[PDB]
Design a protein around this ligand. Structure first.
Ligand SMILES: CC(C)[C@H](NC(=O)[C@H](C)NC(=O)OCc1ccccc1)C(=O)N[C@@H](Cc1ccccc1)[C@@H](O)[C@H](O)[C@H](Cc1ccccc1)NC(=O)[C@@H](NC(=O)[C@H](C)NC(=O)OCc1ccccc1)C(C)C
Ligand code: NA
Lengths: 114, 114
């Protein structure tokens, strides 16, 4: 069962993750069997309350133009992974609701060759 | 208090409301001075938990694509209003990540701000 649109699949640590593309997330989120965790945590404020969640250690993430090293919040209270403004800035993504559904493309309108 | 980019100010119930444009919000949210409330409520799942919130009564929302009626979730636990997929679908918005921020444009590529 995929997250709602807009969504995108990126390779994280070598394997695909399908994210909800989330302009309301300050940083990107994993939710399940996230791999090695840092000892560090962040305070996460959600719509209904806040508490702390652990940072992953660094992950290799395949974007359209290159790999990047990036860390994620591990938030098992979230229903699916969230690709937030941290990674939307690196992708220079555009999100379009004026077509069929909501679609996510690259900086020149290109389906992200990711 | 003021939301990060991408953000947009809309007239809602005759007053300006500055929203975080939130592709991760299934429904749009008002946080302070929501106007009259209905006794209808909904369960909201946030990133860190869930809680029941009330719906506002109907508001006129002045979208660039034309004014419509919409009702909002009143979520006073949220730090700023959220413009979610329910209204982004009506606005047929595009959201463009460029530089360190993000801008909102209309269905025919007209900027809706700046
Ligand atoms: C994911 C978080 C990191 C994010 N929080 C933050 O960004 C805050 C301000 N930042 C912060 O915590 O900083 C972290 C940090 C620290 C150090 C370094 C870097 C980062 C967030 O909760 N963002 C949310 C918006 C928001 C923004 C600011 C403050 C509070 C909320 C949504 O975009 C985000 O997409 C969530 C993710 C999500 C998706 C699905 C489930 C649970 C959570 N959606 C939502 O919370 C919305 N829920 C939903 O869309 C759910 C799926 N549907 C729902 O409840 O249905 C309502 C319904 C009503 C009636 C009929 C049918 C349905 C909510 C606003 C309505
Ligand atoms: Na659409």
């Amino acid at each position: 069962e995929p997250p709602p649109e807009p969504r995108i699949t990126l390779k994280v640590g070598g394997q695909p993750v399908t994210f909800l593309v989330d302009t309301g997330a300050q940083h990107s989120v994993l939710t399940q069997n996230p791999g090695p965790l840092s000892d560090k945590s962040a305070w996460v404020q959600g719509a209904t309350g806040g508490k702390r969640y652990r940072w992953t250690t660094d992950r290799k993430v395949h974007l359209a133009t290159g790999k990047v090293t990036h860390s994620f919040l591990h938030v098992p209270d979230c229903p699916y992974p969230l690709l937030g403004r941290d990674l939307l800035t690196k992708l220079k993504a555009q999100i379009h609701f004026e077509g069929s559904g909501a679609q996510v493309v690259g900086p020149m309108g290109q389906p992200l060759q990711v």
